[PDB]
């Protein structure tokens, strides 16, 4: 489980792993980005992380509650500001009904736009409160994170345009999973471009994929050319 | 905090951080690689994470205790499994007096005339594994951020010079994504049958060749970054 | 105990031995026309025969949440859980259920819940749950499985993956309760008792063992150099 | 962590996986599969499950007691019996000195004057022995690869075919457990050989492996497919 | 996380870090100086400290609010005095809501027109204090450390080029001797009756000046420190 | 209240005010530097911070065992780590027998023949750390107003007076931002081997020297201030 | 935080302190001695003790109210009666909506045309009460210190420069004894009929009458010590 | 109910009120005042203040365990350290019954054990207490504000044992006219350095010449210096 999301002057880029634990020898693939879109009005990503059954509990209930127009939803929520207001309280709901301890805690990104909007990705917490992503800290990560981190940081700005920032949440997973055999593929990956509430560059990954296979490649040949190329060490 | 060690086929390498939560409003800099040294005959290393109060009293009393010839200690131990066996009961002996907000980790590494490189890691419960050619290298601290230059260029095989350039560059990465670890650095490198500790150092923000190789894998990546073909998801 | 369901895009098969240390261990709450749900269990007799005895005694009491008024399998599923944890709160007693069937005006759904009370959902990607003694079956549902594999052949996997699991482990044994679900059919009918004299299950495995072992004979000769 | 071991007519063959668990956050590789070794006298394999500090301080212990004649150690036992006893003597000693901390063990082998033996050591520091009834013994993640072993190995099997079975057992091992992971450590002891010379690495990139998976999972597909039709009435 | 506003005679200076406690592994950048302004009209200005999550809805509700124009905002509140009555109200809804772990501090300083310059301290309870001539400046977050220079040479008559000045040296001083404080910063020179935002900076560690004036302010007590006279106890 | 400790490589320099609040309306002076010393053999220096029962418990206890020769005190103890670990012990039975709000801080330093300068700082938990090079000092109470002071111009190598300078800096900073803090104040200079408690002095709000430093440096700080380049922002 | 006030029949006399406690760790000067005056019509003063945030917002919202002549308030009041209990109004208003840590004391003081001197003390509930001759003055804050110096000096008819002088060595005596008590001190002398608030001041350390009134008080009071006779118990 | 008790140099000097509120309208007169002795090796004074049960049940237990040689008593206990550890366990252990804060109490106990010099000591109802030092030389339980500012400006460690206790009756004077809740009798006490006599131990009643004699010269002192003050220069 490792979730990363981008929000740029351009857009936003979501990236997320399948891999899930759901029991003591039970590990399996479960889709960690699920969509909300109102074609010419809105598109809103959810990012999962943490307790698999309390995750698939929220966006079951949201995704119910979307067919309710009588009920606040992610479909008449006014703004992202209202969407993260309503998860929180989701995420309130899911783990205080399966409570009797962090057993059932999860983390969420949300991330996307609001027609009449700019826009605005958020990290849900466990307690229900939440972050916003700014100019100066641009990006959010769930689940596994670290061995992705420095990259992002390396060459990610809010001025990135997106194509580039995506190649960085690729080589971002490449490191990751490289390191920690509880992130795993297949990815979930999407572009969202500001504007377009379009859903169009949603994208699944496999072990199969041309591309991801030639960029892990490629990156991978050209650090260790890198390496080699150092100048010899000079400790005295 | 962050130590990494390496065990490879011509040597050691050794890497550590050295800054300190003390207190939370108390985090300065601390040296977390201390050496216990027999000219010509052995020659061990040992890195601390973990609570402050806890590894330093362990190593006092690691070094308390080297003064005396009529108890086990670091320059009477046979071997560096009986010295890896002594730090585990040292642990215990400490965190069992101040009482996992005792706990620490530390490595272990180094040669003792008679056998080969041997590299531990003792755990918080005493016990403690061994480095070996399948996993020739150790982290303790906050160490995942720097754990990916590691798997990608790291072998038993890699020459001495080539694994202190990775440990650096590992530090590097880490330095740059997580606050809790801080220069100066303490680095040693051990050349097989040496028994020296004469390639010993500290590195701190001045440091030219370590400006240097962080400058010049910063731009390397970039590059590389920039030269990558473009994006086809379609 | 040792249970399987599979979650198709056609319909559902399930499968459950009932050696237990005879049990059902597949239980079936039918509403002709308008809803077909199966409860499966293993682990804690006490815990199981509990949850499920309060679960089918409530389906007497149209004033109470229960399996025949629920309006989504959704709603199942949080019923469940409810019941483990009343009886958790009430009273080591582990016990794992699978839930399966179909709501009329909802498609296919499949569920595994935990000691806990919580729950997963099966997908697209994770198409079957087992509970119980499940190691040695997973392999061949690994092999030939996938969310769009017809019915037949998701219980013919399922029931190899029986017999793999009846040949390694004795606390697994005949007879078996298995059932074929087909999308929107709401029936009960493909739901059948496997004894030691069934034929077509005698069948199977002697026509599964007979090839593994002709497969084997057949492999390239051993070339580790 | 798997490791199987199985005991024929003809020899031993031995396969261990090495995907290990040190700690949390830490999965590495290492060697789960030890030689003690006497050219023309003796030949030993030790099989490590459970707790890496565990086996290791155990392997650790018996390769440096095996250079001291004054003690009794795996060069000097007599019998592949007194192996057993003397390994679960130092199962306890290490279990009770870093005292969870449990492991299990697999001995096999043979010592000049005796036929071939192996024994499963447990935590507690007993063992049972194999038989020609049940000529195998596992350790760690096993049910997975158990059914294919009941189905095709006996105790007349040959070595080469018992590797085969090991290799497949390995397989939907790997396939159905990420717990398990290569490399892979695999031996082949002929009877009466005291030969370690069939010790194999198998790692992602070795071509017979790669084979006789692919071969496998076509033929089961096959067979699945040639299967005839469901008649359940 | 260190904040600090000055309320002088003629205006008022602001100076805020960047260092973020989001979570545990989670030591980010947020800029914590936000503005409520209106040309020629009011200039307002906010500084967090204290918990992210709670700061961050309590801008973010206010600058929602003040697109509604049929709701008390801070773009129709009359006085500066009612700005901060609003702000403690928003403090106390955000705190009721979501759940001292979701404690935050605000400083609120600023200028409505029809009125001086005004400058308040706004407590987790939603309750606030306001600057006097008598004490003319508040910090919140990490303030020990940078106090003493500010009672040292600010007062209520200090020049607004002076008043910066001290907050860039009660900064530098802060950043030195504690570690949840870091660059960059975000300052700001508000003049009296200005309704102007045109002097706000972002200091980065390249900021030309600021590394003059912290060189010049380090060497000018190493020198004092030097000068002093031998020790007579 | 407010303790500092100082280790150079010259000597010890310590500084503690007075100011001590002892009751809900009862805020009076109370010493907080206390000296253990048996002359041409051992000086060791105790510093208090905390519940004033708590730490003059602790001080009378050890004033009290110093006396008794068949129990372990701090006239027998072989280093200075066993007499932390000795302190570290009397704190915890201290708080055990009147039990946060019994919670104290303590500085140890000081010199037992045979060894050199050591300095530790006990927890209320009854564990210690010990002052390194790197970290070469510490202070208890309240510390954060005089800690840039010390950051600026202290390092390990400081010659004794200016280390002392520095810490009547550090106390007039924090004299003048807080309240709690308060002269009179009790001050010792220990010169390595010397093992004198000669340099022990009390610093009254009369005190010329400490008048003369005081109004010379903040009437430097001032000057300083005023000879900075211009402020330009834009 | 200290302040008296004092009703006699030439006039009425005040004094406050300044030192505040904001928050912990914030203590620093706020003035406790607020003036609502109209020029040949009123003279009302009012002096804070107790939370902060409400004194000031009970302050600043009687002042923003004074501007609105369609609302009750200080200007528009035909009594001081009518003022205590608009002032007892405002308490409770910031109390209730802020939420007994927000508790405040008043006193409110002066004259109004028609009427002659009045004084009341406001409690933390909005009722209050008023002086007479038999209990001349009121107390807030930290009062106990400067108490026995007003019940052996002060009486109904003491006059203004007597009175003033009274509590200026009521102010000494708590100065000295308590150190939530602090100067600058603002201090005022009302005139019976004068409505002027002519006499307001600011007293500093540097007030040269001050020091005059403390040193005098103080030297003669040991004076008198002295010359008491010898002890004779017995 | 106001004790107080000084150490000085020559010795020490106690003073305490004797009005109790043992009930809203039960105030009695009740001494708080109590010696324990043994002529020729120690005196030890306790004075009580709090609730008047827990007080007597602890004074009581102290006097009864006192006839006991098998149980550690204030007869047998080795130094004024020891008892008042004594005391502490006495005070929790009466608490802890009575409770099975309304049952709190504060003590002063003071004197003199052979062997060791003054000590004085304040037990608070925790049971943990404080000792006086040279300085901090004098303690106060109950009532004590308003008496207060006359020892700080007349009393020192050097101070005389006559013009102590005459501090300490002024103190008390003050307090009288202040506050109805300490009242005459008085129980005062001088006890002279080494002497271990109780001998100048008086019940001062309001018939008492002496007391009536230093209050009026007092109150007229006061008055008079009053009088000759330079007017007000504001
Ligand atoms: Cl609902
Ligand atoms: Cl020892
Ligand atoms: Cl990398
Ligand atoms: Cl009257």
């Not at 490649?217 to 050319?225: I, N, Q, T």
Request: charged residues 20%; negative net charge; contains cysteine.
């Amino acid at each position: 489980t490792y979730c990363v999301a981008m929000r740029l002057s351009s857009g936003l880029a979501f990236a997320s792993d399948s891999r899930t634990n759901a029991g003591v020898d039970h590990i399996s693939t479960f889709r960690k980005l699920h969509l909300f879109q109102q074609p010419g009005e809105r598109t809103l990503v959810v990012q999962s992380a943490g307790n698999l059954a309390t995750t698939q509990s929220i966006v079951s209930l949201l995704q119910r509650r979307c067919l309710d127009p009588e009920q606040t939803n992610l479909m008449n929520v006014a703004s992202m500001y209202e969407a993260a207001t309503l998860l929180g309280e989701t995420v309130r709901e899911v783990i205080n009904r399966d409570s009797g301890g962090t057993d059932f805690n999860c983390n969420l990104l949300l991330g996307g736009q609001i027609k009449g909007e700019g826009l605005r990705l958020f990290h849900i917490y466990p307690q229900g409160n939440f972050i916003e992503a700014t100019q100066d800290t641009p990006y959010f990560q769930i689940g596994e994170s670290k061995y992705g981190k420095p990259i992002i940081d390396r060459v990610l700005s809010y001025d990135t345009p997106l194509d580039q920032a995506m190649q960085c949440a690729l080589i971002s997973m490449d490191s990751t999973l490289r390191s920690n055999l509880s992130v795993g593929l297949p990815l979930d990956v999407m572009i969202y471009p500001l504007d377009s509430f379009s859903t169009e560059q949603q994208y699944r990954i496999t072990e199969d994929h041309p591309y991801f296979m030639m960029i892990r490649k490629g990156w991978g040949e050209g650090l260790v050319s890198i390496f080699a190329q150092l100048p010899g060490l000079k400790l005295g």
